[PDB]
Amino acid sequence: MKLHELKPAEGSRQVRNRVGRGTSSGNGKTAGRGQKGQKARSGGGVRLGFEGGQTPLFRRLPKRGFTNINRKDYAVVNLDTLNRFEDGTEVTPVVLKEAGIVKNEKAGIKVLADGELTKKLTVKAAKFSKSAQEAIEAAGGSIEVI
Amino acid sequence: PNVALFKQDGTQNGEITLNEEIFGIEPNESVVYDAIIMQRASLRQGTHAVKNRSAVRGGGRKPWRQKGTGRARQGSIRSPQWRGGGVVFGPTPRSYSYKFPKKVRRLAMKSVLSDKVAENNLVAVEGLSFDAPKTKEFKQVLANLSIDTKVLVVLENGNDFAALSARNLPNVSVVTSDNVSVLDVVSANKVLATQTALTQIEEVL
Amino acid sequence: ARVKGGTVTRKRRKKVLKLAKGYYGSKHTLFKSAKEQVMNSYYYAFRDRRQKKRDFRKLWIARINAAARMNGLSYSKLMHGLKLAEIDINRKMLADLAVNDAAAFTALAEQAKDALSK
Amino acid sequence: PKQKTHRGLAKRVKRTGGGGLKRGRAFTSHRFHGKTKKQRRQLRKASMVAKGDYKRIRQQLARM
RNA sequence: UGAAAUUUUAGUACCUGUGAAGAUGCAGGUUACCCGCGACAGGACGGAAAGACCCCAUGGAGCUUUACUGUAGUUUGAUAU
RNA sequence: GGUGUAGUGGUAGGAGAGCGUUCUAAGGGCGUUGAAGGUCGAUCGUGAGGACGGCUGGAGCGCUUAGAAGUGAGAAUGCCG
RNA sequence: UAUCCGGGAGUCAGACUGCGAGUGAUAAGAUCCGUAGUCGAAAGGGAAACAGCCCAGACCACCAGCUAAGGUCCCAAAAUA
RNA sequence: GUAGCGGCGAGCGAAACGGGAAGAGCCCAAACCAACAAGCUUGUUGGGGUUGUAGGACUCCGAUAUGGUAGUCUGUUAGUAUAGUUGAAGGAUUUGGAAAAUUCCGCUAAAGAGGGUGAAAGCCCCGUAGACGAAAUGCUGACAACACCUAGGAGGAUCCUGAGUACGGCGGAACACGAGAAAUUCCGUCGGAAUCCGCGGGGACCAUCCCGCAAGGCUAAAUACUCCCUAGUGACCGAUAGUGAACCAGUACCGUGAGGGAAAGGUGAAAAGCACCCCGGAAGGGGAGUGAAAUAGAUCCUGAAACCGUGUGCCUACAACAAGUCAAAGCUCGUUAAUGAGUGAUGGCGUGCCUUUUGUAGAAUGAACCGGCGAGUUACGAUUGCAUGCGAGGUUAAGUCGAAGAGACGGAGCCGCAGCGAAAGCGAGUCUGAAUAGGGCGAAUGAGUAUGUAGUCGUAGACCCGAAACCAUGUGAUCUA
Ligand SMILES: [K+]
Ligand SMILES: [K+]
Ligand SMILES: [K+]
Ligand SMILES: [K+]
Ligand SMILES: [K+]
Ligand SMILES: [K+]
Ligand SMILES: [K+]
Ligand SMILES: [K+]
Ligand SMILES: [K+]
Ligand SMILES: [K+]
Ligand SMILES: [K+]
Ligand SMILES: [K+]
Ligand SMILES: [K+]
Ligand SMILES: [K+]
Ligand SMILES: [K+]
Ligand SMILES: [K+]
Numbered sequence A: 001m002k003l004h005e006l007k008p009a010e011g012s013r014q015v016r017n018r019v020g021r022g023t024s025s026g027n028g029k030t031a032g033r034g035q036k037g038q039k040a041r042s043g044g045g046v047r048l049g050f051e052g053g054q055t056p057l058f059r060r061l062p063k064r065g066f067t068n069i070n071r072k073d074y075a076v077v078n079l080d081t082l083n084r085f086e087d088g089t090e091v092t093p094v095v096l097k098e099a100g101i102v103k104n105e106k107a108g109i110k111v112l113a114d115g116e117l118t119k120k121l122t123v124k125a126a127k128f129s130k131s132a133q134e135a136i137e138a139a140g141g142s143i144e145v146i
Numbered sequence B: 001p002n003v004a005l006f007k008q009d010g011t012q013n014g015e016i017t018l019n020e021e022i023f024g025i026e027p028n029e030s031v032v033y034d035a036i037i038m039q040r041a042s043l044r045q046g047t048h049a050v051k052n053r054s055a056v057r058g059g060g061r062k063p064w065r066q067k068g069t070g071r072a073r074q075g076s077i078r079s080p081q082w083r084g085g086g087v088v089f090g091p092t093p094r095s096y097s098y099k100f101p102k103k104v105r106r107l108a109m110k111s112v113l114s115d116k117v118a119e120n121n122l123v124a125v126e127g128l129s130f131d132a133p134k135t136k137e138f139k140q141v142l143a144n145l146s147i148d149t150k151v152l153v154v155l156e157n158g159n160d161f162a163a164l165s166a167r168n169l170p171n172v173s174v175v176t177s178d179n180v181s182v183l184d185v186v187s188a189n190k191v192l193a194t195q196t197a198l199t200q201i202e203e204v205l
Numbered sequence C: 001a002r003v004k005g006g007t008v009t010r011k012r013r014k015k016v017l018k019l020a021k022g023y024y025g026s027k028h029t030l031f032k033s034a035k036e037q038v039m040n041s042y043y044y045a046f047r048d049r050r051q052k053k054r055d056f057r058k059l060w061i062a063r064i065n066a067a068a069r070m071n072g073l074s075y076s077k078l079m080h081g082l083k084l085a086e087i088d089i090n091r092k093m094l095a096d097l098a099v100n101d102a103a104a105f106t107a108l109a110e111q112a113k114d115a116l117s118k
Numbered sequence D: 001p002k003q004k005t006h007r008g009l010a011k012r013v014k015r016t017g018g019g020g021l022k023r024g025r026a027f028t029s030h031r032f033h034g035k036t037k038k039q040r041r042q043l044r045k046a047s048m049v050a051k052g053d054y055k056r057i058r059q060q061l062a063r064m
Numbered sequence E: 001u002g003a004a005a006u007u008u009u010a011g012u013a014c015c016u017g018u019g020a021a022g023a024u025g026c027a028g029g030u031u032a033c034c035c036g037c038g039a040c041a042g043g044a045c046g047g048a049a050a051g052a053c054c055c056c057a058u059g060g061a062g063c064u065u066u067a068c069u070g071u072a073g074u075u076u077g078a079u080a081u
Numbered sequence F: 001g002g003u004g005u006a007g008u009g010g011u012a013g014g015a016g017a018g019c020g021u022u023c024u025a026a027g028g029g030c031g032u033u034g035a036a037g038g039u040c041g042a043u044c045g046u047g048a049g050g051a052c053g054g055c056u057g058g059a060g061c062g063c064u065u066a067g068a069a070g071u072g073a074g075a076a077u078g079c080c081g
Numbered sequence G: 001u002a003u004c005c006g007g008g009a010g011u012c013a014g015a016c017u018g019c020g021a022g023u024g025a026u027a028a029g030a031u032c033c034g035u036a037g038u039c040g041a042a043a044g045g046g047a048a049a050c051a052g053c054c055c056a057g058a059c060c061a062c063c064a065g066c067u068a069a070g071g072u073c074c075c076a077a078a079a080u081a
Numbered sequence H: 001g002u003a004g005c006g007g008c009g010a011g012c013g014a015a016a017c018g019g020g021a022a023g024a025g026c027c028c029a030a031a032c033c034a035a036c037a038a039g040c041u042u043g044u045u046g047g048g049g050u051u052g053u054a055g056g057a058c059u060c061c062g063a064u065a066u067g068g069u070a071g072u073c074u075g076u077u078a079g080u081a082u083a084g085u086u087g088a089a090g091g092a093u094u095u096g097g098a099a100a101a102u103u104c105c106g107c108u109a110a111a112g113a114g115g116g117u118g119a120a121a122g123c124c125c126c127g128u129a130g131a132c133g134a135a136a137u138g139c140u141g142a143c144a145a146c147a148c149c150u151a152g153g154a155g156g157a158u159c160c161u162g163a164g165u166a167c168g169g170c171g172g173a174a175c176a177c178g179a180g181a182a183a184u185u186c187c188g189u190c191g192g193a194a195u196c197c198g199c200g201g202g203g204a205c206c207a208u209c210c211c212g213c214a215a216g217g218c219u220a221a222a223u224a225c226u227c228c229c230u231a232g233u234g235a236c237c238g239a240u241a242g243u244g245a246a247c248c249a250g251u252a253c254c255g256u257g258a259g260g261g262a263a264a265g266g267u268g269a270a271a272a273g274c275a276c277c278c279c280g281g282a283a284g285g286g287g288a289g290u291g292a293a294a295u296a297g298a299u300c301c302u303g304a305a306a307c308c309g310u311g312u313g314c315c316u317a318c319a320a321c322a323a324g325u326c327a328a329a330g331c332u333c334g335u336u337a338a339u340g341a342g343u344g345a346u347g348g349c350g351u352g353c354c355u356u357u358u359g360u361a362g363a364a365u366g367a368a369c370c371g372g373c374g375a376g377u378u379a380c381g382a383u384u385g386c387a388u389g390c391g392a393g394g395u396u397a398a399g400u401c402g403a404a405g406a407g408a409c410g411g412a413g414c415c416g417c418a419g420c421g422a423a424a425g426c427g428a429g430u431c432u433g434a435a436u437a438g439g440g441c442g443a444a445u446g447a448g449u450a451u452g453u454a455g456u457c458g459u460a461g462a463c464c465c466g467a468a469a470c471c472a473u474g475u476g477a478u479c480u481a
């Protein structure tokens, strides 16, 4: 390109709308705020979720549940993703991380049976769904609980 | 692609091949535009400020009582409507620099270089050597190569004499092969690069 | 990037004042009064470009009425007769004939009277 | 600064797979003698935040 | 010798009527040559003061008490010296 | 680009597209043979607005594309003169 | 045209007119609803003047024509039909 | 913005792990030994020792080295700060008062940054690139010297290892944690341990296990800030702006005092600042001069509008006027040459602008006029649209190098690709349920992500102006009691 012939991509940049700059612009005088009231004031408006004094929805509804301190979440992997490897490959958490399939393993890799497996693989993971284990074994592979 | 190689004296050697990944792609106009805008913004210093009513000197007391005087009610002699009062909003020191995805940055650089090559504004010289820095000699070199417009001279690292002899010419902008920017390439109408510099560029990208 | 007032303000206000040339005193001297008057001038001008057509049709009708009476006919009877006689000469031209070409106007009136008789 | 989460709502609702909000039911605390067994049975079941209420509160849960 | 309040621009009539319901300015009619000077104060809902009366604001302040919640002081006990 | 049909009052307000101001970059220009600015003119565009001449003035300023905003005043018993 | 999904609102003082009711005294330019219109946010013609009534919805130009409500002796266009 | 805290409201809000900047570790008390003085211990000095895979004393051995410093107004040396030296290259022609401008030829460049010079200068000047320079006084870095730290192994019989301390009750406070189930830390009051088979912590508490060793001290760097000094920068201001202050500004002025707090820049290239003459008492003018220009004459560049005045082309003394608009004779004049311009007898129509209202010509509000200034902004987040890059992937943050740039590295981390459940947990399902039933939420039925931009929102004063008031320092009994 040439510095004297620059052209942005169509629709990439827009013009800021400036309020209170004459009537014909459509945002003169009141600047789109309307006429009087609380919302027409500088810094006006009520806090989010406020309802003018009616009991807000969150106040109406009850608190529920708790968070388990020892909660364990697993990075999930499916047979479709496993199909990305070749027969006889040794699928490992390190292998998945290097492949970028599982950037964060959380508490460990758990393999699920969402897709259809088609390669014989020796999969090592923290946990396997029973269906996932059946699919891996039925495809001629094996599963080891790391 | 292939670009004619010239010797410093001006005579042409055999052509040399440039990596198609770098000098052979279809340039991306919008990406180039984004890079130019972003770099120009990053050049901004943005040291500018104004004094709001709280920063202006004095202005604590109420100028006169709320009611009775028949005058408009005022709260401080430094209110924005007052002559010498504070400034409503206005500039504040800030930075205008942002960053693009690395892939977009790389694509923009390749696009400008490929654009130069396609337009045949890329002149590759086998080498630029000067026993001592002499602007007259480098100007003669440009004449031999038949370059008379804005030219970006890209030199391999360490070619201090070449860089010195070239820098003072108004139409010449000197950069090292390691430190080249989309803005530099686009500003220059032609790009004069030595073969070592081109090799280093291809290595970098 | 400070943008001081500049000269756009003076340019705009001078345009208004030039529009107001000829007004009475302050109405041509002062911008606020001038602008107020120029706005009313616009309102009146737009209204009068419509009233102008009404006024001239009214003037033509009055003149045609006078001429028709001199020819022994009321305006209403004359126009009814002309419509019956298929004459489409409009009121502007009819008034022109009445004032200038009384002979031609009399011919038109005679045709109208003939049509009415039939 | 970082926008804050409304802690009361965080305790009371759950984000669902489809982006909606799962909520408990009101009138499930006491005074059950005043409610028919059908009412208790059908209030035992969770529900979803209505469209109007969700549009009012979504920004308070952006990063729940 | 030389101010001031006020002041949207004013070539600034009367009656009846109309109108945000009390018109110099609108309608109909009537009266009235142009410019002043000295006087009067009926009108310009005249000037002056973002009405103090009245109501409102989830306003302020001072005061009161067997309003609420506190607390300085006074007093009683335990404990240490 | 043409034809046809239909449509084009508007406050709060939503959408769209533009005018003009200062500055930055690049390109291309103009200036003691007179820039900006001021004033006058019967000029041009659908609008904001744009030129062109005369006079005044005496040194800086347009235009194209893109960019950033202390970017547009007639009212605040606004402030200053 | 309706739905649905999403971005952005403003509105929560209404007025009168006709019709159907309440309250009132079968008073109010009263009050409160239902219903339609208009004003609000609508210029133009008529009703003397006259937001809400009658006719009728201004993108512009014309010194062209035909009509609506309402009118045709003069003010004042049109029948002393 | 998670775990949490919270009239479980408004809101407040971590830490550890991970990635980086920077890195450095050391001394006593005690036991024990020697000396000394008193009055066998008990105090001064010295030695000795410094810890958790327990260390030390003490007893045996063997070593009298090896390394080091966060020391020194100790010298030597180098650099550097505080003055400076040097530093290339142009003449003509045109216009002009004047050349840097125009035109023709040149020349320099490790210097084409910048400023000045009679207008705009690479080559006229100051400079810049580059080279060089310090008597004296600082500062830094080295080198030396001095100074000061620096021992290995084996045994435990005994001895030491911080007391009104830790800890507890009560009352407060700090920990994001508001007494709460409440750890941990700290203050006041009272009570009050153990001591290596010992003691503390791992969020009440106990047990087990693990980790550590309080009640003694010191310790550079990474970090925060800039009254000042030097050199620079700016899509920062350009005289109502920018500091309140471009100028004799915290001045004038105001106040008893604390305190409040202005206005005010521009002749010309050069004063060449108008010799002399005339009117006038002067002021001020008219000539005459200086100057390119004096309508640049010091109230001095430009010189707007309000406001005031002189001259006059047209009109006006029977007229009821929101001042105009439409129609228009007459008169005057001749343009951006346009079916022109000024004025205007007379005729038609016609109650300003704004705000606020159901409704305002309104006898409701605001504006005396003119000029200037004067109101939705930025930062960080959220969300949607549009755009671009990549795409079941997308992407870096801090930080290092770099011109205050781009860029490179940096994959920690974040979003997405799996959901369901309060949770254990299961998983294209899951929850409820006795249920292979039904139903809820999901999948079948796939697009995300980084950035730009715009709309809106949240935290911030959040579009601008405006209270009566509240609180915390101060100044006031020169009036008055
Ligand atoms: K709005
Ligand atoms: K709930
Ligand atoms: K309940
Ligand atoms: K009124
Ligand atoms: K009077
Ligand atoms: K009081
Ligand atoms: K001009
Ligand atoms: K602004
Ligand atoms: K004003
Ligand atoms: K909608
Ligand atoms: K009704
Ligand atoms: K956070
Ligand atoms: K609350
Ligand atoms: K020692
Ligand atoms: K120069
Ligand atoms: K020295």
Ligand SMILES: [K+]
Binding pocket: H182
């Ligand atoms: K606690």
Ligand SMILES: [K+]
Binding pocket: H201, H202
């Ligand atoms: K611990």
Ligand SMILES: [K+]
Binding pocket: H211, H212
């Ligand atoms: K530990």
Ligand SMILES: [K+]
Binding pocket: H296
């Ligand atoms: K001058």
Ligand SMILES: [K+]
Binding pocket: none
């Ligand atoms: K005159």
Ligand SMILES: [K+]
Binding pocket: none
């Ligand atoms: K008239």
Ligand SMILES: [K+]
Binding pocket: H364
């Ligand atoms: K009043």
Ligand SMILES: [K+]
Binding pocket: none
């Ligand atoms: K976006």
Ligand SMILES: [K+]
Binding pocket: none
């Ligand atoms: K089921």
Ligand SMILES: [K+]
Binding pocket: none
């Ligand atoms: K199911």
Ligand SMILES: [K+]
Binding pocket: none
């Ligand atoms: K995308």
Ligand SMILES: [K+]
Binding pocket: H461, H462
């Ligand atoms: K603000």
Ligand SMILES: [K+]
Binding pocket: H462
């Ligand atoms: K805002």
Ligand SMILES: [K+]
Binding pocket: H477
């Ligand atoms: K006294």
Ligand SMILES: [Mg+2]
Binding pocket: A016
């Ligand atoms: Mg923008």
Ligand SMILES: [Mg+2]
Binding pocket: A026, A027, F013
């Ligand atoms: Mg609007």
